[PDB]
Amino acid sequence: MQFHLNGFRPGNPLIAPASPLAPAHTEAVPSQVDVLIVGCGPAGLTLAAQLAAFPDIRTCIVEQKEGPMELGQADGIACRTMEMFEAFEFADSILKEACWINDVTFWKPDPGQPGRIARHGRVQDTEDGLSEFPHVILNQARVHDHYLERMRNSPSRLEPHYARRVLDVKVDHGAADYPVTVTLERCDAAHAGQIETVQARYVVGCDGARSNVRRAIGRQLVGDSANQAWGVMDVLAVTDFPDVRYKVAIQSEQGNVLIIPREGGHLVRFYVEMDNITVEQLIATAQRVLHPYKLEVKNVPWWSVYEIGQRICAKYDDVVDAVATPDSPLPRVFIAGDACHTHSPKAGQGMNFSMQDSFNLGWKLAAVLRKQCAPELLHTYSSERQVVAQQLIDFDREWAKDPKEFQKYFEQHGRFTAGVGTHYAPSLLTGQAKHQALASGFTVGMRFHSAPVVRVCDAKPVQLGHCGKADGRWRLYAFAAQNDLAQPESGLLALCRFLEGDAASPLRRFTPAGQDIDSIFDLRAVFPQAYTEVALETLPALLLPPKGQLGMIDYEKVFSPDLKNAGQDIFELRGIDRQQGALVVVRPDQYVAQVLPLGDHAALSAYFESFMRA
């Protein structure tokens, strides 16, 4: 992290100075806002945390509950989700508190012994090289706590307006501004029944399975009925079952159970398959399933009956057209998370997929509100997120049931549950991949698979993808050709010359006057030479850019590979064409948009000209 850019600032640097652009939080909900977010669940808080970074945007998030939750329903945190948490700068804390899932063990009835289970298998939960983060388990409420802290400490000093139930949402297609009218009812005793009305430019329903926003815009969850029903209980118990601290799938003649070890080393969650349910019944069933192993429950902090069918909305916004074109009406209301797609418990997605909906939408709304991107960009939210959620359902539709074909489905299921399987098809934002071989390890349309590199300014070993923070900026990862440092006339250095000095450059065309040169496009250069061979003093100013009020130099734009440790060279690991180099264009949500030749300046310009505004 970088700080003290404009002068010494005492205290925790993660606490940003309050921006004068963001009015102080008021007891009453403001009369007009840029974005009204409905629901403080994972989807809403992810979106709020993202928008909190932009104090010039007036964001209001409402929640019917009267305050933050202390114990949540979800607890699974996927590898790709941890990568997003790193973008929000709190992955470290989650890693220290959460229960890591390293192995998953499988138990089944013992062939030579009646009414007893025995261990039948064990698998490494996350395949080697899949992600730099592990899969972990942590009370949903703690994730909310981190987002709320991020919102509070942001320049916006954003905090929720609790005890507010959104009753209706209406779009006035003839309105000049703030065309969306939201009606809310105050739920606390002190204001019970009081009605509040808010006018907004955009509204996002992150209000869950029974979303009133979805209903307001006439969308409906289409799918199959509750495929199954699960009794779920978080317990503090004593057992002699040896695998209780692992994630465990148990099949027995007494019923099926899934064990999810919880944060703290003691709490454990049991999913008991079912279909007047009491916790006593759930416990009794788990005991019968675990026999001969004993289970003595001392305390049950929470339990419930988790049952939901797989359903999905045909569209995630208020635009009727199934597939939008340049003449379709522009969207004003969006729905994210469970409000538009519910995945069966089998899917194993938990709250992970819902938060990716918000991470997709956040930067787009910010860019459009700031007049940096055409409103048409907003159509890509539904077209990207609805499609991948439906494709996921199609897969889990069949995954619901040769021996090497099963292992294949098992492996794919692992990539999907880890959240790294998302692959957007060609579109306004995603290329066709005709130059994929320039960087074969950075698949166009998929998330930027981070790899180690060494920072040239100080030899620090770092993960390249961690340059991608949740600050709304696009990233340009330029991997230099072998002779680029020695031959500035072409390749990487020529690209830099073009970006900084050519009027047609997207950097010159789209970076607002007066802002830092890397405020829209975050360019990072990676050379194949050892860090000791890259002379910073000889590089273009674009790669050692001054920024802020004092013109301080940003020394973190230049990297080399890890050449000390065998097999850790990113050019090898990510299949970079060494003789040609490659430009990997990454969106603010960390998804790869393009893999282009370093010298195709015209294509780079044309890409951004297609949706950004000068």
Ligand X SMILES: Cc1cc2nc3c(=O)[nH]c(=O)nc-3n(C[C@H](O)[C@H](O)[C@H](O)COP(=O)(O)OP(=O)(O)OC[C@H]3O[C@@H](n4cnc5c(N)ncnc54)[C@H](O)[C@@H]3O)c2cc1C
Ligand Y SMILES: O=C(O)c1cccc(O)c1
Locate 345 and state its tokens. 């418990």
Q: How far is CA 597 from CA 453, 491, 581, in A?
A: 21, 9, 7
Among 305, 446, 552, 563, binds a second copy (CB under 8 A): 552
In whole angstroms, the minimum distance from the beta carbon of 233 to ligand Y comes to 12
Tell me the one-letter amino acid at 262.
Answer: R
Backbone dihedral region for residue 586 (phi beyond 0: left; psi -120 to 50: alpha; all else: beta): beta
Q: Do 48 and 57 meet the contact criterion of CB atoms below 8 Å apart?
A: no
Residue spans of beta strands (DSSP E) within 418-506: 452-455, 461-463, 474-479
Locate 600 and state its tokens. 């195709």
Residue spans of beta strands (DSSP E) within 411-506: 452-455, 461-463, 474-479
Does residue 528 touch ligand Y according to CB under 6 A? no
In whole angstroms, the minimum distance from the beta carbon of 223 to ligand Y comes to 20
Rg of the chain in Å (alpha carbons): 25
Pick from ligand X, ligand Y, a second copy, none: which does 612 bind, CB < 5 to 8 A by kind?
A: none
Which residues, numbered 437-476, are part of the site for a second copy (CB under 8 A)? 457-461
In whole angstroms, the minimum distance from the beta carbon of 40 to ligand X comes to 5
CB-wise, 260 or 339, nearer to ligand Y? 260
Count of C-beta atoms within a 10 Å radius of residue 613: 15
Which residues, numbered 352-391, are part of the site for ligand Y (CB under 6 A)? none
d(CA 439, CA 442): 6
Q: How far is CA 26 from CA 62, 66, 158, 319, 516, in A?
A: 13, 16, 11, 33, 32
Does residue 468 touch ligand X according to CB under 6 A? no
In whole angstroms, the minimum distance from the beta carbon of 375 to ligand Y comes to 37
Q: Of the ranges 212-220, 231-239, 383-391, 397-405, which one interacts with a second copy (CB under 8 A)?
A: 231-239
CB-wise, 76 or 599, nearer to ligand Y? 76
How does strand 333-335 pair with strand 195-205? parallel
Does residue 76 touch ligand Y according to CB under 6 A? yes
d(CA 51, CA 472): 9
d(CA 346, CA 348): 5
Among 238, 314, 323, 425, binds a second copy (CB under 8 A): 238
Q: Is 419 labeled as ligand-binding? A: no
In whole angstroms, the minimum distance from the beta carbon of 63 to ligand X comes to 5
Pick from ligand Y, a second copy, ligand X, none: which does 304 bind, CB < 5 to 8 A by kind?
A: ligand X
Q: How far is CA 68 from CA 160, 281, 306, 399, in A?
A: 9, 30, 21, 36
Count of C-beta atoms within a 10 Å radius of residue 70: 12
In whole angstroms, the minimum distance from the beta carbon of 143 to a second copy comes to 13
Instruction: Please name the residue that has the structure tokens 């009267």.
Output: 66
Q: Is 51 labeled as ligand-binding? A: yes
Q: Is 271 labeled as ligand-binding? A: yes
In whole angstroms, the minimum distance from the beta carbon of 158 to a second copy comes to 20
CB-wise, 60 or 418, nearer to ligand Y? 418
Among 181, 304, 390, 391, binds ligand X (CB under 6 A): 304
Got the DSSP string for 257-283?
EEEEE-TTSS-EEEEEE-----HHHHH
Q: Of the ranges 57-65, 251-259, 424-432, 547-555, which one interacts with a second copy (CB under 8 A)?
A: 547-555
Q: Is 42 labeled as ligand-binding? A: yes
Q: Is 269 labeled as ligand-binding? A: yes
Q: Is 527 labeled as ligand-binding? A: no
Residue among 380, 561, 599, 366 at smallest CA distance from 484? 599
Residue among 261, 58, 27, 302 at smallest CA distance from 157? 58
Pick from ligand X, ligand Y, a second copy, none: which does 99 bind, CB < 5 to 8 A by kind?
A: a second copy
Helix axes 42-51, 140-153, angle to 10 degrees: 20
d(CA 162, CA 29): 10
Q: Is 319 labeled as ligand-binding? A: no
Among 30, 109, 309, 348, binds ligand Y (CB under 6 A): 348
Q: Is 103 labeled as ligand-binding? A: no
CB-wise, 75 or 484, nearer to ligand Y? 75
Q: Which residue's Cβ has the minimum distance to ligand Y? A: 76
In whole angstroms, the minimum distance from the beta carbon of 252 to ligand X comes to 20
CB-wise, 75 or 556, nearer to ligand Y? 75
Does residue 165 touch ligand X according to CB under 6 A? yes
How does strand 103-109 pair with strand 117-124? antiparallel
Does residue 306 touch ligand X according to CB under 6 A? yes
Tell me the one-letter amino acid at 519.
Answer: S
Q: How far is CA 119 from CA 110, 116, 242, 248, 410, in A?
A: 8, 10, 10, 10, 19
Q: Do 337 and 358 meet the contact criterion of CB atoms below 8 Å apart?
A: yes
d(CA 432, CA 136): 34
In whole angstroms, the minimum distance from the beta carbon of 61 to ligand Y comes to 25
Q: Do 50 and 589 meet the contact criterion of CB atoms below 8 Å apart?
A: no
Among 207, 384, 556, 562, binds ligand X (CB under 6 A): 207
Tell me the one-letter amino acid at 43.
Answer: A
Among 29, 260, 267, 583, binds ligand Y (CB under 6 A): 260
Terminal C-alpha separation, the chain: 30
Which residues, numbered 8-27, are part of the site for a second copy (CB under 8 A)? 8, 10-13
Helix-then-strand count for the chain, H and E: 13, 28
Which residues, numbered 338-377, are part of the site for a second copy (CB under 8 A)? none
Q: Do 247 and 101 meet the contact criterion of CB atoms below 8 Å apart?
A: yes
Pick from ligand X, a second copy, ligand Y, none: which does 11 bind, CB < 5 to 8 A by kind?
A: a second copy
Does residue 196 touch ligand X according to CB under 6 A? no
Among 29, 34, 35, 42, binds ligand X (CB under 6 A): 42
Q: Of the ranges 48-56, 256-264, 387-395, 484-492, which one interacts with a second copy (CB under 8 A)?
A: 256-264
Does residue 350 touch ligand X according to CB under 6 A? yes
Handedness of CA 555, 558, 562, 567 (dihedral sign): positive
Does residue 354 touch ligand X according to CB under 6 A? yes
Residues that bind a second copy (CB under 8 A): 1-5, 7-8, 10-13, 70-71, 92-93, 96-97, 99-100, 102-103, 122, 141, 145, 234, 236, 238, 240, 242, 244-246, 261-267, 298-299, 301-302, 457-461, 532, 535-537, 546, 550-556
Q: Which residues are annotated as a binding site for FAD?
A: 34-64, 73, 166, 212, 269-271, 306, 338, 354
Residues that bind ligand Y (CB under 6 A): 75-76, 137, 247, 260, 269, 348, 350
Residues that bind ligand X (CB under 6 A): 38-44, 62-65, 73-74, 76, 164-166, 206-208, 212, 232, 304, 306, 337-338, 350-351, 354
